[PDB]
Design an enzyme around this catalytic site. Structure first.
Site, PDB file in Angstrom:
ATOM      1  N   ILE A   1       7.151   7.010   8.580  1.00 22.79           N
ATOM      2  CA  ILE A   1       6.693   7.188   6.832  1.00 22.79           C
ATOM      3  C   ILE A   1       4.848   8.215   7.055  1.00 22.79           C
ATOM      4  O   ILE A   1       5.358   9.442   6.369  1.00 22.79           O
ATOM      5  CB  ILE A   1       6.793   6.387   6.314  1.00 22.79           C
ATOM      6  CG1 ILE A   1       8.402   5.579   6.053  1.00 22.79           C
ATOM      7  CG2 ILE A   1       6.309   7.166   4.668  1.00 22.79           C
ATOM      8  CD1 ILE A   1       7.372   4.346   4.953  1.00 22.79           C
TER       9      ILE A   1
ATOM     10  N   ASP B   1      -4.376   4.164  13.067  1.00 26.95           N
ATOM     11  CA  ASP B   1      -2.939   2.769  14.337  1.00 26.95           C
ATOM     12  C   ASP B   1      -3.348   2.614  14.990  1.00 26.95           C
ATOM     13  O   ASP B   1      -4.140   3.138  15.323  1.00 26.95           O
ATOM     14  CB  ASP B   1      -1.962   3.861  13.474  1.00 26.95           C
ATOM     15  CG  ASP B   1      -0.505   3.000  13.594  1.00 26.95           C
ATOM     16  OD1 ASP B   1      -0.418   3.220  15.395  1.00 26.95           O
ATOM     17  OD2 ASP B   1       0.310   3.149  12.835  1.00 26.95           O
TER      18      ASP B   1
ATOM     19  N   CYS C   1       1.945   1.824   5.685  1.00 25.99           N
ATOM     20  CA  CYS C   1       1.730   1.068   6.678  1.00 25.99           C
ATOM     21  C   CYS C   1       2.043  -0.696   5.851  1.00 25.99           C
ATOM     22  O   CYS C   1       2.420  -0.705   4.602  1.00 25.99           O
ATOM     23  CB  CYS C   1       0.413   0.632   7.375  1.00 25.99           C
ATOM     24  SG  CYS C   1      -0.778   0.334   6.090  1.00 25.99           S
ATOM     25  N   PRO C   2       2.381  -1.554   7.110  1.00 22.50           N
ATOM     26  CA  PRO C   2       3.257  -2.845   6.695  1.00 22.50           C
ATOM     27  C   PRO C   2       2.391  -3.432   6.816  1.00 22.50           C
ATOM     28  O   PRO C   2       0.809  -4.092   6.642  1.00 22.50           O
ATOM     29  CB  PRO C   2       4.119  -3.251   7.737  1.00 22.50           C
ATOM     30  CG  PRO C   2       4.309  -2.561   8.824  1.00 22.50           C
ATOM     31  CD  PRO C   2       3.314  -0.831   8.548  1.00 22.50           C
TER      32      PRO C   2
ATOM     33  N   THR D   1       2.163   3.999  -1.616  1.00 18.72           N
ATOM     34  CA  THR D   1       3.239   3.313  -1.640  1.00 18.72           C
ATOM     35  C   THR D   1       3.857   3.094  -0.639  1.00 18.72           C
ATOM     36  O   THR D   1       5.109   2.743  -0.151  1.00 18.72           O
ATOM     37  CB  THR D   1       4.401   4.964  -1.138  1.00 18.72           C
ATOM     38  OG1 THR D   1       3.844   5.515   0.502  1.00 18.72           O
ATOM     39  CG2 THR D   1       3.826   6.464  -2.313  1.00 18.72           C
TER      40      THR D   1
ATOM     41  N   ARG E   1       3.009  -1.592   0.298  1.00 22.22           N
ATOM     42  CA  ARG E   1       2.538  -3.048  -0.689  1.00 22.22           C
ATOM     43  C   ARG E   1       0.840  -3.087  -1.733  1.00 22.22           C
ATOM     44  O   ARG E   1       0.184  -2.833  -0.881  1.00 22.22           O
ATOM     45  CB  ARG E   1       2.878  -4.039   0.373  1.00 22.22           C
ATOM     46  CG  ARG E   1       4.553  -4.149   0.617  1.00 22.22           C
ATOM     47  CD  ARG E   1       5.094  -5.213   0.165  1.00 22.22           C
ATOM     48  NE  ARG E   1       6.783  -5.594   0.720  1.00 22.22           N
ATOM     49  CZ  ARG E   1       7.032  -5.905  -0.294  1.00 22.22           C
ATOM     50  NH1 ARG E   1       6.668  -6.489  -1.789  1.00 22.22           N
ATOM     51  NH2 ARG E   1       8.567  -5.911  -0.858  1.00 22.22           N
TER      52      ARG E   1
ATOM     53  N   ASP F   1       2.696   3.625  -6.098  1.00 29.28           N
ATOM     54  CA  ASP F   1       4.379   2.795  -6.244  1.00 29.28           C
ATOM     55  C   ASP F   1       4.352   1.227  -5.907  1.00 29.28           C
ATOM     56  O   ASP F   1       4.157   0.668  -5.377  1.00 29.28           O
ATOM     57  CB  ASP F   1       4.591   3.143  -5.346  1.00 29.28           C
ATOM     58  CG  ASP F   1       6.379   3.796  -5.614  1.00 29.28           C
ATOM     59  OD1 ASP F   1       6.410   3.477  -6.876  1.00 29.28           O
ATOM     60  OD2 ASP F   1       6.894   3.760  -5.041  1.00 29.28           O
TER      61      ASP F   1
ATOM     62  N   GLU G   1       6.162  -7.115  -7.171  1.00 31.14           N
ATOM     63  CA  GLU G   1       4.503  -7.200  -7.110  1.00 31.14           C
ATOM     64  C   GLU G   1       3.770  -6.124  -8.890  1.00 31.14           C
ATOM     65  O   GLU G   1       2.847  -6.658  -8.651  1.00 31.14           O
ATOM     66  CB  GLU G   1       4.063  -6.385  -6.132  1.00 31.14           C
ATOM     67  CG  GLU G   1       4.651  -6.722  -4.474  1.00 31.14           C
ATOM     68  CD  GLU G   1       3.646  -6.065  -3.673  1.00 31.14           C
ATOM     69  OE1 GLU G   1       3.299  -4.620  -3.397  1.00 31.14           O
ATOM     70  OE2 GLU G   1       3.870  -6.085  -2.328  1.00 31.14           O
TER      71      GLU G   1
ATOM     72  N   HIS H   1       7.913   1.417  -8.568  1.00 35.59           N
ATOM     73  CA  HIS H   1       9.189   1.750  -6.656  1.00 35.59           C
ATOM     74  C   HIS H   1      10.003   2.498  -6.947  1.00 35.59           C
ATOM     75  O   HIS H   1      11.404   2.672  -6.724  1.00 35.59           O
ATOM     76  CB  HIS H   1       9.331   0.291  -6.293  1.00 35.59           C
ATOM     77  CG  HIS H   1       9.963  -0.179  -5.702  1.00 35.59           C
ATOM     78  ND1 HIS H   1      10.195  -0.873  -4.586  1.00 35.59           N
ATOM     79  CD2 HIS H   1       9.906   1.068  -4.142  1.00 35.59           C
ATOM     80  CE1 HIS H   1      10.606  -1.318  -3.121  1.00 35.59           C
ATOM     81  NE2 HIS H   1      10.056   0.257  -2.598  1.00 35.59           N
TER      82      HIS H   1
END
EC number: 1.1.1.28
Lengths: 329, 330, 329, 330
Positions: free
Chosen positions: B155, B174, B205-206, B232, B234, B258, B263, B295
């Protein structure tokens, strides 16, 4: 040097004042139009600064000269507003905006495209009241789609650069094919091919007698159902009655238009002995995936700074000499 | 086989049906939530298809089994709503869609950026009523600005390709720098540098314990005044209390978020006896250059098709007793 | 006589022109504000017509006098923008519209009230997009509830008449009770009683030293939870910070305010560490059942016609040398 | 008794719960529609409570019976969704709310009128963003104008009282005269006269063969240019094609309509062939001084409480073996 600025908007003032730090003028801002009646307000100012809707014909110019104004400055490109014969003759020095920002315009076109695609304007209407429903917001993935740009001058190429970033297949139509475009991998094609193959079409070209109503009924017939069309170029490139029909037929999926101010009025069509034509903006916006902006394509800080910066540099010279070519002689 | 689809939206139905031409399942669409009470509506279907809000707790699973259901397909990446242990004990099989189209999501992040930048959302509110005033709409030219992307998985890289298109200076953070990014001319830097230099920042990122509240008060303090931030990813990547302050202080220029379903209901952190929210969404939207979407990042036809294909393919493997790589357990 | 009209809105023009059919004034309409700089545009006019934002200070008056102006007509009740001492000294005559149509103002208050009650403003936001959800739109039946009106001059009485038609119990507070109100069946009471028992409260009184911040924290404490408050009177009648807390507390159910131009910056909140003081309007509108209008209470064709007639009549009386009861000295 | 409530909205639940404080039914609320498929969810309930969109056809009724339901309560006046013959045959009893609070409905009509008159809905769109421009918001003073009410049952009379308070002259068309109305000072007249002389018109009458398309091309022709029309009654009282044309011609100044759930299609232009649509609502709302509400006329706490008490009271009487005046057959 004292400068009277007409048709002032808050953005005009903000940037002019900021750019003025390095010229030092005394600035006087008026929110109203320059007219024969208001010209007298310039008295005491060596110069005036005007924009697209200000009145620059002889009658206004006569009043200005009478009031001691020497220099006139357009923060602008369009001059259909001014009667240029007279100024030279009246001893009145003059100018416009030669340089403009291609990236600002292209970026606006892309922004319109994305907003329409993902129905972000609609989403905002909802979420601003904490309505998170997604029904009706579904878009399309750009990547791998075909983009057709009509006109490959600097703006058009700037757009192509962005569209290349999206991973789209790039097509273009221009009578004067550009190396800059070829270097991006663009394939130049005829209009019929462009209309036939493009998922997204964007107009970045000057109006000519030849391209008047370039996008017409016949053109729409050629396009893909659901096609997205963006016009940050002149309004007359599109036959509005045909576009309206094509929206109703569902040939056009989305339409974005940046509306030029002195085209707004003649924008347009039907009315029955009704109803000129803010009604069209209202109806299309409500009933279709249609988005209008008010000649907003150049409205960024960087673009405004550039317009201002020059405007001051010119006057500063004039306050003493240069070619200019600020000056239109 | 017959499939009962819960929490069905019109887009879910359209794309599932379209994809299903290749599959031939018998589809039954329900608009309501799967719960202990509605599980009985599945009777006669071997499989059910659910989304993030549906209830996959043990009592529900127990009812589903009681009603002859063998298979559960999540038409989404998240599975916290489903009690996997209970499912295993009960003999149920659970499958999911492990990722969304990277391009769709990245494109959504970019779309939020441009809409915010040019205040297009505001313009429409005006022009829909034939008001063409430009006051307050002024944006920034992207070209030559600096973009910082946090996270260079598929992404993030997809976003970087677009950003490269805008002619931005590209920075990234990263732990595992990617050749695909490097190939774009991306310069990897530490967070402190990315925060200091970026005109626009986008999170791809996660969520990890490590990066909980990554964008916090110290982070915002580091940033450029007027910075644009897009999330976009979490919500917990961002310390909301800190963001709200940064907005008030005009450190953050623009914010696009988003909002994940699991959440939304949970902003607190915190208040007293009067009174709480969806108010924050309303206030921020009104008072700042802020955009929320629900979302919506994967909401494109192509992405929905991919989700549909994976889901039916998963079901198809389960039906046959073929091992499904998207299964959440044995 | 030739008359220059400043700060002209389309509605000002439409009704002034309509009324003038009976007078034959020569009308020149300007969209812009009257200022020391623009006062020169009045040259050739014996009179000017201005509104609440126009600048009537001494420097402006001097310019107008130099430019041949004799008469200044306020197409409004307020005159805080005009320096009456200066005008007198300069030999200029100033006239005003002493009151707005009471019915128009009262009706606006009721309109605000009903819109808020049934959340009609919210409904439109939905239904304009074909969203028919009713959640959050529930109101209250007016019939049988108690209304409290603070101030029983002509506007307050007009309001009471309407409220009576809804089948409400009528309470009022005025230091000087009105015969028309009593004849209507109104019960006059103390403020504490009005605050305690009223379901709906509406302010229809002039501002005074006494009533500054009349609706304050202590007042809001005495009210019923969910009370509706309407203010078409001056802003200072309410302590904004208190009002804000009371909304937040949920003591105030609904608030409608017709916001006066001069009072626009003053109100409301903490607020913003500089621009913008407008955010209060945005925040309250989104987060609560709150409705603002821009001094719209007199904006009906009939009320505008009355203002227009009074103004033209005032001016004729001036020219003819007759006594103008609307004169400000 | 246990009652299952279908198609539940937050307002239905709140008022039903509040009223139940005095009844002690055991209540189970479902957000979804009653259909043949969801009828099973009612097992354990003697009664179900439904609204205008719920499916009351024979197949549904059969399911309900199989699942032990004896009573069907409509929390509304309309009952065309329920197959009364089938119900009677199946031994089910059906009760309704025969009428809504007249004051609530009339007050709604007046509210629409005032909102339209002063363009308050438009104003809010502006001022919510601190735009205080008044251009296009000009209304009219009600006092001294003429109001014409079509229908003088309890609702029309309640509306007249309000209109009287405004200082308006009262006209009405009803074949049948009302003591309350006469007593109010109303002047009865024929339709032609009402149409000619009314500044504002409000419809407060049931639909009959005799008034189908009562407001038609011919009627609009008789009306005053700029006239205001409010319809909180059924849609078919107005010829929509004629209305739309009258708006376009500027004969109708303002139109307010409370749109019944079962009637969205009554209102049409049109050439939106692709494809039949809510578009009319979006278009008229944008292009004209038109306001739609979604059958909101009874949406007040008091009116809802009344519906709730009537519904619980009907159920109670049914349990008793008592005569329910509100039953649809016996």
């Amino acid at each position: 040097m004292k400068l009277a600025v007409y048709s002032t908007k808050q953005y005009d003032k903000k940037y002019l004042q900021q750019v003025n730090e390095a010229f030092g003028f005394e600035l006087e801002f008026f929110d109203f139009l320059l007219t024969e009646k208001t010209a007298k307000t310039a008295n005491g100012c060596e110069a005036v600064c005007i924009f697209v809707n200000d009145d620059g014909s002889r009658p206004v110019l006569e009043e200005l000269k009478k009031h001691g104004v020497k220099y006139i400055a357009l923060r602008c490109a369009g001059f259909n507003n001014v009667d240029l014969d007279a100024a030279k003759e009246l001893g009145l020095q003059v100018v416009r905006v030669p340089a403009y920002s291609p990236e600002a315009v292209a970026e606006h076109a892309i922004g319109m495209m994305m907003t329409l695609n993902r129905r972000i304007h609609r989403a905002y209407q909802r979420t601003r009241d904490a309505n998170f429903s997604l029904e009706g917001l579904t878009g399309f993935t750009m990547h791998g789609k075909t983009a057709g740009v009509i006109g490959t001058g600097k703006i058009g190429v700037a757009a192509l650069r962005i569209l290349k970033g999206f991973g789209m297949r790039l097509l273009a139509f221009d009578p004067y094919p550009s190396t800059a475009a070829l270097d991006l991998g663009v394939e130049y094609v005829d209009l019929q091919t462009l209309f036939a193959e493009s998922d997204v079409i964007s107009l970045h070209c000057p109006l000519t007698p030849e391209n008047y109503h370039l996008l017409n009924h016949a053109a729409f017939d050629q396009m893909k159902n659901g096609v997205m069309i963006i016009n940050t170029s002149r309004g007359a490139l599109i036959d509005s009655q045909a576009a309206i029909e094509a929206l109703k037929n569902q040939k056009i999926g989305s339409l974005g238009m940046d509306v030029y101010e002195n085209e707004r009025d003649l924008f347009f069509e039907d009315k029955s002995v009704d109803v000129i034509q803010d009604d069209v903006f209202r109806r299309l916006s409500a009933c279709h995936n249609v988005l209008f902006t008010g000649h907003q394509a150049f409205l960024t800080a960087e673009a405004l700074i550039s317009i201002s910066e020059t405007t001051l540099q010119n006057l500063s010279q004039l306050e003493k000499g240069e070619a200019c070519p600020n000056a239109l002689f």
